[PDB]
C-alpha cells in the first residue's frame, strides 16, 4: 500500500537561507534525505535572498516531507516562505537506468 | 463560488531576459499577484559559428505560484512585460500544483498561496 | 499522432557539472535542443561518523537541466540526457518528468504545445 497513491511528487520549498541546515537534518530524520538546493531571491504579498529546496519523493508521503521542512523552516515571522507539492509522472536513475518510483 | 484555476493551484514558470525582470515585477504587482521567486539561469532555444547552436545565454527564471489569480492572467502579465519581439524573449510554462503550505502559519491548500 | 499524448512535459535532470556539454550535444541530436540550466547543489540517498557528518553538512555541486517538450517524447529526451550523463558511479543524478498544462511563447504570443 504505497504512499503518494503509488506515484511520485516534487516537494518544492522556498525558505530562509539560514534554515537550510535544520531542513537538511529534518529531511534525514523523516527518511527522505535527498534534496537539490538553489540560491534564489523573491518576495511574497526589492528581492530578498532565499533558498529553494527540491525533494522528489515516492517512499515517503509528500505531506510528511513538506511538514518536516515546514517545521524546521518555521520562525513565525514574515519571510518564512512556502512549500508546494507538484505531480511527477516518471523518473529515471542515471547510474542504473531504473525507471518509475523505484528510481526515486 | 467560481474560484479561478478551477479551484486549484498552478505554477507559472517564465524564462525571460534579465533586463526585463523589473518590468515583470511591476506587471505582477499590477495584476494582483506580486509573489515571485527568481533564479539566474542560462539556456538556448530552437535551432554558422557557435552563437545560436551551442552557447548558453544568460536568462532569468521567474516562478509564481497562483490560486486567487488565474494562471493565464499572470502568464499574460509576464509575457506582455517581457516581450520585445526578438529571438530570446523566452517562454512561459504553467504546471499543476497539488498542495501548498504557508510556513509561517501552517495553513494549507489554496489558502496557503 | 502526437507524442506525450498530445501534451507538454517538463524534463528535469540533476547531473554532474562536467556532463553538461555532452548533454547539450545529446539534446541537439535527439531533435529537442532547448534547455534551461541552473547551478545547484544537493545530496542523494544516505558507516563512519566522519562520512556521516560530511553527509549532514556537505552538498555537492550539480547542474539542473530543464527541457520542456511536446514534439519529442519526454522519455526519449530523458533517455538522451541519461545516456550522456551516465558514468556508472554514485553522483550521476536523476531525471524527473513533470506534467505541463500550458505554455506561452513570449515573442509571438502563441500558446499550447505549439509554443514549445
Ligand atoms: N506564490 C508564490 N510564488 C512563488 N514564490 C513564492 C510565493 N510565495 C512565496 N514565495 C517565495 O517565498 C519567499 C518568502 O515567502 P513569504 O510567504 O514568507 O513572503 P511574505 O510576504 O513574508 O508572506 P507571509 O507574510 O505570509 O509570510 C519569497 O521571497 C518568494 O521567493
Ligand atoms: N522548451 C524549453 N525548455 C526549457 N527552456 C526553454 C525552452 N524554450 C526556451 N527556453 C528558454 O528560453 C530562452 C530564450 O527564449 P527562446 O529560446 O524561446 O528564444 P529562441 O528559441 O532563441 O527564439 P524563438 O523562440 O523565436 O525561436 C532560452 O535561453 C531557454 O533558457
Ligand atoms: N529524490 C531527490 N530529490 C531531489 N534531488 C535529488 C534526488 N535524488 C537525487 N537528487 C539530486 O541528484 C544529485 C545526485 O544524485 P544521485 O542519486 O546520483 O546521488 P546518490 O543517491 O549518492 O547516488 P545513487 O542514486 O546512485 O545511490 C544529488 O546531489 C541531488 O541534488
Amino acid at each position: 500500500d504505497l504512499p503518494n497513491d503509488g506515484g511520485i511528487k516534487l516537494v518544492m520549498a522556498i525558505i530562509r537561507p539560514d534554515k537550510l541546515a535544520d531542513v537538511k537534518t529534518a529531511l534525514a530524520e523523516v527518511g527522505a534525505p535527498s534534496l537539490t538546493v538553489t540560491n534564489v531571491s523573491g518576495r511574497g504579498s526589492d528581492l530578498h535572498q532565499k533558498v529553494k529546496v527540491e525533494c522528489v519523493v515516492a517512499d515517503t508521503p509528500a505531506e510528511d516531507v513538506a511538514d518536516a521542512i515546514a517545521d524546521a523552516a518555521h520562525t513565525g515571522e514574515k519571510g518564512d516562505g512556502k512549500i508546494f507539492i507538484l505531480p511527477v509522472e516518471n523518473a529515471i536513475q542515471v547510474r542504473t537506468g531504473k525507471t518509475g518510483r523505484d528510481a526515486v
Side-chain angles (χ1 to χ4, degrees), chain A residues 1-77 79-97 99-104:
Chain A
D1 216 19
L2 310 171
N4 310 297
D5 199 21
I8 314 167
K9 312 287 180 193
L10 165 64
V11 176
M12 182 200 293
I14 318 299
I15 59 157
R16 296 173 187 273
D18 68 1
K19 283 296 186 178
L20 183 61
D22 289 343
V23 165
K24 284 198 292 180
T25 312
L27 285 165
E29 291 191 355
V30 87
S34 285
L35 83 164
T36 298
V37 178
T38 316
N39 297 309
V40 295
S41 47
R43 78 189 173 185
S45 300
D46 212 13
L47 268 19
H48 304 109
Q49 287 261 64
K50 302 290 173 188
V51 155
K52 177 192 281 170
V53 172
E54 291 195 330
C55 306
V56 181
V57 299
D59 287 359
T60 316
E63 275 187 339
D64 292 342
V65 171
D67 289 342
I69 301 167
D71 291 345
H74 173 91
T75 72
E77 311 285 334
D80 276 9
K82 279 165 195 165
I83 305 169
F84 313 108
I85 305 170
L86 289 82
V88 178
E89 272 180 26
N90 200 3
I92 293 179
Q93 204 177 74
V94 184
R95 178 183 57 93
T96 53
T99 68
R101 52 175 282 103
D102 287 357
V104 176

